[PDB]
Symmetry: D2
Subunit: 266 residues, 4 copies
Amino acid sequence: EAPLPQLRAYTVDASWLQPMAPLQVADHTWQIGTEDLTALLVQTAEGAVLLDGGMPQMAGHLLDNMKLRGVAPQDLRLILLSHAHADHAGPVAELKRRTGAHVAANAETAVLLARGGSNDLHFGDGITYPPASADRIIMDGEVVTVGGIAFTAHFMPGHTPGSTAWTWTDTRDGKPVRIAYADSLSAPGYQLKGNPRYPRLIEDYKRSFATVRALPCDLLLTPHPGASNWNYAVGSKASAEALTCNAYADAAEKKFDAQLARETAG
Amino acid sequence: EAPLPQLRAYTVDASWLQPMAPLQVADHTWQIGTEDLTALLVQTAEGAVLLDGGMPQMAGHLLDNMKLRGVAPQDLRLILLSHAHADHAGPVAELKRRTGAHVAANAETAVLLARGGSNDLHFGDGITYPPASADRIIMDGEVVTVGGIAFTAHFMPGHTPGSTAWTWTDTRDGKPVRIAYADSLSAPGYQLKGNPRYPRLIEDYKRSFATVRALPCDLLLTPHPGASNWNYAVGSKASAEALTCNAYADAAEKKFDAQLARETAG
Amino acid sequence: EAPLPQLRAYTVDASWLQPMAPLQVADHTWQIGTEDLTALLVQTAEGAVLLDGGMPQMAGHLLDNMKLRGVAPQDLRLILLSHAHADHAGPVAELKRRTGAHVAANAETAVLLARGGSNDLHFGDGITYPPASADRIIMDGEVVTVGGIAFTAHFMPGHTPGSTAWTWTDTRDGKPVRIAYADSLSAPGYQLKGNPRYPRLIEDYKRSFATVRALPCDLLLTPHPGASNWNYAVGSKASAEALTCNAYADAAEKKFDAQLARETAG
Amino acid sequence: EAPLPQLRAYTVDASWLQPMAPLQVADHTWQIGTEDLTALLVQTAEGAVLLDGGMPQMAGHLLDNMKLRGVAPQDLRLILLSHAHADHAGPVAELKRRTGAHVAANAETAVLLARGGSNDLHFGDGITYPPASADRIIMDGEVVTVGGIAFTAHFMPGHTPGSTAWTWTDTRDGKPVRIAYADSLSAPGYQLKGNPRYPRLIEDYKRSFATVRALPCDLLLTPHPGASNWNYAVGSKASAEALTCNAYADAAEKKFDAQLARETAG
């Protein structure tokens, strides 16, 4: 007599959905997402690059901020992703339609993006979003160049099989600033041990800690700004407490090792 | 200061989600969906065919009913669709994964199914579901045969560009029963006139009325049972008030012509 | 003892592969393909449109001709298709990779393009090419606009299920010139009657003749220039003997009706 | 005046295309491909598994051999792949269409298979084949079970990014036989050093040698039988000279290290 349950929406903290004006990270790099979701616009002489887009409903806000930066919709050349979950890749389909941008991603990110996050290794169908196609498949270490700005992929599987850190070198004053945009190193609610859908999950995480430790980095950013102790809401002091790559990886690994012991204990 | 709106789920009438035991339509054809969502199981000597699956959360109920009919998950050979909206194609992805079934559909249904109903001509991204791939592309009039039971496709564009009616001949007692499973002929909230995403919408609907009128049919069924005056909840009297194809098409066209005049008037 | 046969390549007349310099059709429209394969470049204030690309090996030649016209690879915004056979859509995948262009096509063209022409309704796997993805799905009559130039789709199924004629209005001197780029109306070696993979082939062809007859047209062009009596090799006299839409459709229908009678007779 | 070059077909040694009758490997495992292309049929109580299919033109021969083994087309449940090149995955699309089988593969194999081998990291578009879709995405170490026979994936990137070795335990007499079906460890004509499309090629090969060395294995087989010193043409003595996993990996690594030094020297 009880009916089947209704579908539930992917609802998130209001701060994840709180718009912010563009916040400059370096000479050509801007945070244009929300207070608690990173979306990085990199502006070049030959068009703009977007790294991540946040939630699906953020598409219009992203275009507004791009316009504030002098970037028309057609000027967006490329979208890069940390990972293909709804809260970071949510608006990619709409953005492609409205900009003509291409998406570059590794094969794992591509196949998750192409099914809109459904059949997730850990979340099933609970966190879906409009599917999008990857236009260029990226390999570990491959360099993607737009307007003379070179973006290098560093695979860091774990949070998703396709999780990627992206590095590039901007400037601030006249000195180079090596930026590292590293994916999450958390395993929120994952079954870590003997996971049939991810048998080498622990090995991949362990390797990804070491990958993040060794990234070329003067300024680390993360898809959730709090993961690297950014505070987008405080303007020019936003980066003041930012973690190093070593401190970020160290903290992730201690959190991981605890969760692993607590899984052995229940 | 107002955050972006949260995502909203596709919630439906409880009767759409009310499970029912299998209800026999003819010697090999059974309703195995819910009280207000049709899902037809056709059982052959060489496996079963499923026409439509209802909402995404109906996958487990469909498999339970199949099991009641003696059909193991692996015995489902083929899934056919009326149209690729979330309330009729919702569980197809999961069903493919759990059964090994193939999906046959026309090109329009295939491309909508492959994007999980996102970027709908009328509903945008408001009604998405897990994407699935079509294994065989069907043309208008093409015959799909499983276990000697021949299913013929009749394209009836309008409700969706890929909307399809499926016909086959079952038996009841020892007499043939030509079944027609016809898609919806409604345009719920659609902009009918000068729709940029569907410029020939009116012409297609007009043609589809005539297609439905001429279907070979002794027993009409529809994805929403109320559209053809079925009442699944009353057991063996469920078909008593069922419409003919002529009466179904007639009523749809009068509803369409009214909505069209009311669009000219606002 | 006989081994399986080797794969055979899709080889074509040398004139299909004979490069030509850009040939101006109207103020913004240029033939930039080969002597016997049409590829139309339309240049706008906000980027270029390419209608068809010919054979797969024509990608580099197309880019050379675009460069001659002042169009850098990144300036190509959009690719449109008459139909997704190897000799007209052959280089689309490579062109997308090298230009960032998006492809717009109807659902039938999209699914054939996505399987690289394999499992063709008539040719099987004999004429394959690198698959490409459609970025925007087009409906019959839908208008695609780039740089203020409006391209309208007119579906003309037959040669392929997704065959499309594209119309737009250019200028010559200061007078408008309605261009019609119409797909082939031939059925080369097709089984016309009772074709299981295309049961309504005859009806679609018959309707497509009438569609082509009624196209808005001052200048007709076709994917094979000889089909509309163009001669690309003679420069400014190339259009002199060009057919009207009526004469093109008339001739196609007489050819079709003959082939149909000869199929009844063997 | 010279026309563009014609397309060239992927032609291979006649022995790759020389049909053979089924050759028993263990109680449930049979070679059913050609003399020089492995295609392994594993027969279970609940349907058959095919590991690799060889060249595209081998589809009909594979079905003939399956029929010889008592496996009807519909009885093939699953296709697994070593890698998605035309000479081992060639007939997968046709096989899916004619059998209802599902394909399981890792994300890299899936994306290469989905573009029919086009845009290969090393071969470009020179070796294409009809694209096919993967129905289940596999992770490293994941177990796929059909009829109680468990197949484990072991990723061994290098020959292709998605190259996979598959292991399972059959029987011979009444003793277990751990079979290892390992992909190629060759780099035929690849640029090994500083390859922009595969920056970590050397690291992946180096790791894959060690993966192959440690596979659980009593009987090694390879997609090209000569790579592991099988001789399918000599019947029951076919396995006599077969390599161990250690000897196969050792020989591959010495070949790789030589080619690497010869690349430094030209």
